């Protein structure tokens, strides 16, 4: 009965669908303005290096589901996602002289492949399964568990919890190559670094826990 | 947002059928009205259309032509009222030099129209050009517009669907000059889709209405994901960065009568089919530079990964030795019948395209040695004194071939 | 899974009636739809068919032919819509050399079709070939396909149902050459079912429609257990290993009018009947090499053991002195009437088959001494210079006869 009167009438499920939608279109125009700060400037933009804490307002009938420590995890994945959209768009908006372009495809590929992995293979696989699960909610408690078994797993597949200084930092430091090379528009000293860190990336990730092989091809 | 610049009879038609396809996809009535079933639509319309106070939608299109007949026929079609009469332009009254001279002559009104259209969009992304490189109108007018546009707007993309002359068939006797000059301008100003009648009609076999219906299909499938926002590849610049001359291929190029064979169509078989030279709509161990496959319909990324793995192992493709594909997924319009379980479009950059120019260069060199049909060109101011323009263009094309 | 390559008029028909029998067995509608009573079926369909998004099932068949008439008639049958129009191939416009020359000419499209079909199966096991060895089409085209297939796919089985020319009846005047060359290719490339019109029509007596209905019956009964999974013999390779040229026989070869004599049919009487030379559908103390008996219907292994014991004691058969049979059981399709209480099919390898070639060799030697009908062969490139191909083929066949 409770789940029945909770689909509408304090529609907790409807609110949940919007949550994972207003981040993870609309949010494309929002970030592009940030590329070219102030704390009130953003609000009118939204209503239209690692910060931008985002929150939301939830009514009491759904407060018990989307807890306070649940907002931060949803915020955690949003921060990291933008840095990927950043590097992906920074190397995209533009269009031994031509030798730079060979450093573009050798790099614009790699960040693009990673982005194809986090969003499609993870942020859409578990998402497609989660919706098929909540539509069979039959309990006050288990709806928390099926939900809590969606964040604590999406925070693991997207490598952000542990093994950060062992694996995650590698993707982080090579992301700085997407910033340095973007501004300049020394060249030989980039591939010596790039061919090293990229090989450092594969020769470290080679330990593969098993789902990492979907990107290990490149 | 985006603008479309279509020139010559080829471009004019191309635009007609491209907008026909678009209005079919987005549920836009011929008169610009919106159907009742599509009232609550989720599809993004700003990209190619802008709505009007009368609730009708107007394309971001401009019609250009040296002759009236084609556009006059267009305005007698059921789709006539849709276009914007203000934007359409017709010359009051077949050579590249003449075309460029007119372009110099009619700068003001054309750029007036272009500016008016541009100022109506907040986030214009680039330009789309549809034209033929052989005929006098398309070649010269596109040359002039590209030059003055790259000069005017140094921060907008310029995309073209350039139609190349048939070669096996001996149409424009003076085609080598126009083609060579248009190629010069394309290299020197164009940001980024080659097209030829020969292979296009070859695949059509194995009227201009059907040929250009196929071409419009290619264009629409190319712009689908931009039209239909998703997760990845949410911008034209994303497309261009992932590849950068191009060639194209589309799997479900099936007649309205050829739906009887409802073949169980996986993603693997489609993406495979997009690789063969037969499906490449255009006609030294030449290899690829880049490949993009946009897939419409239900798709499981596990299937995509498996197909990619198998094709990689089967080594059906060849890549550059000096550098390290992409498979994007979209959603079909909710309106047109999904006669195909899953469909695929491919855009690639491959070195073999060089041969095209080698032919045209060979054609051009086969004339410049004997000064054939230069009398008309000398008439225009640009080639009134000399033809150094021609020499520079030829050397530029040679440099591009050497670079390939 | 498996593919079928049928060539020439003989092969084309063979395929038509083979697929007729298959669709009858599996409850597949003529249009490819599935009947309501067969919705919950347990029979395995992937082996010979692949389903489509439209729920229809498509055979893994390819039609090849030098002439259009036969296939055109096929497509006018009620079963026309079932086949895949893409796979079917017809030459746009009676000799082996000409057939092989065309095969060299039309390599690309044929192997395109074959690759497309192959990539749609996860666990393809081998190939099936149906053709006649006398006529120009079947002989040469099968030769070329076998050569290029054994070259292309070195890890797939190749099974054939080769139809041999009648000899008591004096049909192809140039039959000796085509037969000898096809036999060369069969020995040199074929993994593993001989067929002759003479004895086949003899048993039929004691139109091509009925003859090939019997042949399709043989093929289907051979593939039954593969189609219907059980415990043992769950793969074609299991079949081949248990035997390895072959000949065949089927007990319940009874007209639709000859069901009046419902004879109490044990397993013993059937398996016995499969041994007699009369039932061997094909026409020195020659002996056996291997025998396999597949039995359909209710069967008690005690009965099988008793029959085997009694036949062994009665020594009705002869075996090689230098080496040390098999009786497999299957289940009938749940649909076709079980007019027979228990039925039996036999495939065996026996040395007497050698005689066949001795006849054809005798035929060929009876011509090569006088250079009869070589004018057409000299026309083709393969036999343009010399006929060393013929000498090598003859010596290969002689070597095979010596080995037997």
mmCIF file of C-alpha atoms in Angstrom, chain A residues 25 91-93, chain B residues 229 237-238 241:
data_model
loop_
_atom_site.group_PDB
_atom_site.id
_atom_site.type_symbol
_atom_site.label_atom_id
_atom_site.label_comp_id
_atom_site.label_asym_id
_atom_site.label_seq_id
_atom_site.Cartn_x
_atom_site.Cartn_y
_atom_site.Cartn_z
ATOM 1 C CA UNK A 25 20.653 18.420 -23.771
ATOM 2 C CA UNK A 91 40.405 19.417 -27.367
ATOM 3 C CA UNK A 92 37.299 19.590 -29.575
ATOM 4 C CA UNK A 93 36.256 23.239 -29.904
ATOM 5 C CA UNK B 229 20.614 14.909 -27.580
ATOM 6 C CA UNK B 237 32.782 20.043 -32.917
ATOM 7 C CA UNK B 238 32.828 16.730 -31.074
ATOM 8 C CA UNK B 241 37.591 16.504 -33.472
#
